[PDB]
Amino acid sequence: PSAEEFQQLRKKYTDAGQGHVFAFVDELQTGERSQLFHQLSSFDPVRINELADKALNPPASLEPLPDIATASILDSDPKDLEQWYEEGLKLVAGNKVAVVLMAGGQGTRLGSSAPKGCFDIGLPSHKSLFQIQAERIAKLQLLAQRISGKEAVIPWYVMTSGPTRKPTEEFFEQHKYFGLNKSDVIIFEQGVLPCISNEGKILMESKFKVAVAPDGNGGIYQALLTSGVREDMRKRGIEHIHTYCVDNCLVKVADPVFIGFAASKQVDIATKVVRKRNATESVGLILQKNGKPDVVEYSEIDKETAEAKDPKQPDVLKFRAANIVNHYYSFKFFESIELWAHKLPHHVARKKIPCIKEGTGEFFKPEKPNGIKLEQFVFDVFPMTPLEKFACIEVRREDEFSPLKNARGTGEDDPDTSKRDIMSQGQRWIEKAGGIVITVGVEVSPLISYGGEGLEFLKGREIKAPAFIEK
Numbered sequence: 382p383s384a385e386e387f388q389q390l391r392k393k394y395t396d397a398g399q400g401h402v403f404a405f406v407d408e409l410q411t412g413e414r415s416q417l418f419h420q421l422s423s424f425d426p427v428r429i430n431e432l433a434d435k436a437l438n439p440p441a442s443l444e445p446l447p448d449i450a451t452a453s454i455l456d457s458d459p460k461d462l463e464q465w466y467e468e469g470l471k472l473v474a475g476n477k478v479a480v481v482l483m484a485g486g487q488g489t490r491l492g493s494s495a496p497k498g499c500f501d502i503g504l505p506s507h508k509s510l511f512q513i514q515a516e517r518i519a520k521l522q523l524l525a526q527r528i529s530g531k532e533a534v535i536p537w538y539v540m541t542s543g544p545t546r547k548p549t550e551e552f553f554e555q556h557k558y559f560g561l562n563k564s565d566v567i568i569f570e571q572g573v574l575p576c577i578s579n580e581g582k583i584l585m586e587s588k589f590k591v592a593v594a595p596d597g598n599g600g601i602y603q604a605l606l607t608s609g610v611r612e613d614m615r616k617r618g619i620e621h622i623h624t625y626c627v628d629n630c631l632v633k634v635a636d637p638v639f640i641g642f643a644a645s646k647q648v649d650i651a652t653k654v655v656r657k658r659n660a661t662e663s664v665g666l667i668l669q670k671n672g673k674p675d676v677v678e679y680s681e682i683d684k685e686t687a688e689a690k691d692p693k694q695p696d697v698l699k700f701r702a703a704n705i706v707n708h709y710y711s712f713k714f715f716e717s718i719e720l721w722a723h724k725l726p727h728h729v730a731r732k733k734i735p736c737i738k739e740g741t742g743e744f745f746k747p748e749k750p751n752g753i754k755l756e757q758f759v760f761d762v763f764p765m766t767p768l769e770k771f772a773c774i775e776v777r778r779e780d781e782f783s784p785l786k787n788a789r790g791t792g793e794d795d796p797d798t799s800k801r802d803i804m805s806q807g808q809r810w811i812e813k814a815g816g817i818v819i820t821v822g823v824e825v826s827p828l829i830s831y832g833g834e835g836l837e838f839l840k841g842r843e844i845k846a847p848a849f850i851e852k
């Protein structure tokens with residue numbers, strides 16, 4: 382970096398009212414100086430000022446989704462369920478189905494040292510969430526072959542952040558990709574935005590480093606372009622994508638019912654919900670806003686809409702379609718990302734951000750929250766999508782949604798509720814297949830059963846819970 386170049390960038394920053402990021406250049410090594418220059422060269426402080434301004438100095442008709450845009454597996458015609466299952470498996474067997482795992486979370490409520498997908502919830506197998514998910518992919522590729530007599534590939538695109546990327550890659554490598562082919566698993570990274578003081582100023586982590594944070598799960602779309610992942614999908618002939626969150630231990634990865642349902646309705650986007658468990662559950666609610674499909678995040682909803690009651694049913698929530706972060710896209714939808722990625726709004730959250738005191742140089746952790754994180758949300762493409770190209774499908778919580786949000790000891794959405802849900806699931810499947818569990822719960826490996834099939838061999842047999850059915 383020359384003097385002219387360093388000076389021209391300084392000017393940009395100074396003119397933008399962000400000159401303080403250069404206030405310790407005085408006392409910097411030649412390479413700490415380049416760390417600062419290179420990182421500042423990758424932000425436009427004017428767009429930073431623009432974001433900071435909408436966030437800090439900021440400027441609906443609201444009904445349930447109409448029944449044309451909604452379905453449920455709890456009351457679908459069984460002929461439909463069967464047809465959707467079959468079509469989903471055929472699309473898997475045609476190598477047209479990809480999976481995008483959103484694993485860009487630091488997992489702050491869980492306070493673990495490792496990525497959340499590495500977490501062992503205490504199952505007898507001691508498998509991670511990542512491994513459980515990989516094995517569902519493996520098992521579904523096998524089920525697909527049973528009706529093609531040919532290999533079935535579901536590529537697995539794993540989206541991480543700066544914080545999770547390296548440990549995620551090491552973990553996958555140390556487990557030999559959980560038995561999948563390395564060449565059908567791509568680990569990529571979401572982008573970042575700088576953290577912002579309450580007063581609009583870029584926070585500095587050190588005297589040579591801007592404080593940045595992941596740009597939210599809504600960062601998926603831009604990261605699909607710049608990572609090369611969308612191009613890999615085009616190359617492989619992918620036409621259908623299942624996107625989910627890593628923290629859900631029950632997630633039906635590439636669920637064939639979901640895929641076949643969406644593909645046969647020819648939507649651009651579909652999404653899963655469950656019945657909200659109470660007014661206060663920390664879930665987005667899917668609904669119709671200003672004529673369009675939309676989500677209100679739990680952090681942005683008002684008490685009155687969260688607590689509104691169904692007129693005919695005075696104890697049931699009016700808005701109870703809980704977002705479980707299981708989305709479908711057509712590949713064609715991803716072909717349009719350049720035209721609307723930029724229109725995704727920035728959600729704001731107050732944060733305690735450790736930084737350099739501006740003036741002192743003192744690398745302090747703050748008492749009250751001293752700034753803000755900006756995040757895009759994955760579901761903010763929903764109102765971009767016509768009702769007729771959108772579908773929402775209700776599923777059963779007990780089979781499809783068990784999130785790991787909190788640490789052992791919390792009492793909900795934690796490792797013990799997760800463990801209990803998998804093992805309770807496994808016992809239900811066995812009991813349906815004819816087995817007898819003595820006693821709690823049973824862990825069924827995904828390689829044995831994806832979704833409750835293949836357990837005939839257990840008919841008549843007694844199983845002493847807790848148990849583990851594997852190879």
Ligand SMILES: CC(=O)N[C@H]1[C@@H](OP(=O)(O)O)O[C@H](CO)[C@@H](O)[C@@H]1O
Pocket residue numbers: 598626663664665666678679703704705706758759760784
């Ligand atoms: C932007 C986004 O994906 N938000 C999701 C996500 O919330 P968290 O901020 O990750 O707790 O998971 C919830 C399900 O556990 C879902 O209800 C919500 O809408």
Ligand SMILES: O=C(c1ccco1)N1CCNCC1
Pocket residue numbers: 678680728729730754755756
């Ligand atoms: O409110 C926020 C938020 C907005 C911006 C950064 O974090 N969240 C609440 C739940 N969804 C994701 C994070």
Ligand SMILES: Cn1ncc(Br)c1N
Pocket residue numbers: 445453654655656700701702703775
């Ligand atoms: C009729 N309705 N509203 C939310 C949800 Br779930 C359902 N099934």
Ligand SMILES: Cn1ncc(Br)c1N
Pocket residue numbers: 649713714717720721765766
């Ligand atoms: C093809 N296309 N263009 C804009 C949007 Br939204 C979509 N889905």
Ligand SMILES: Cn1ncc(Br)c1N
Pocket residue numbers: 445446447451452453654667668702773774775
């Ligand atoms: C009223 N509503 N919203 C999502 C879903 Br399934 C339903 N039924």
Ligand SMILES: [Cl-]
Pocket residue numbers: 649714765766767770
């Ligand atoms: Cl669309």
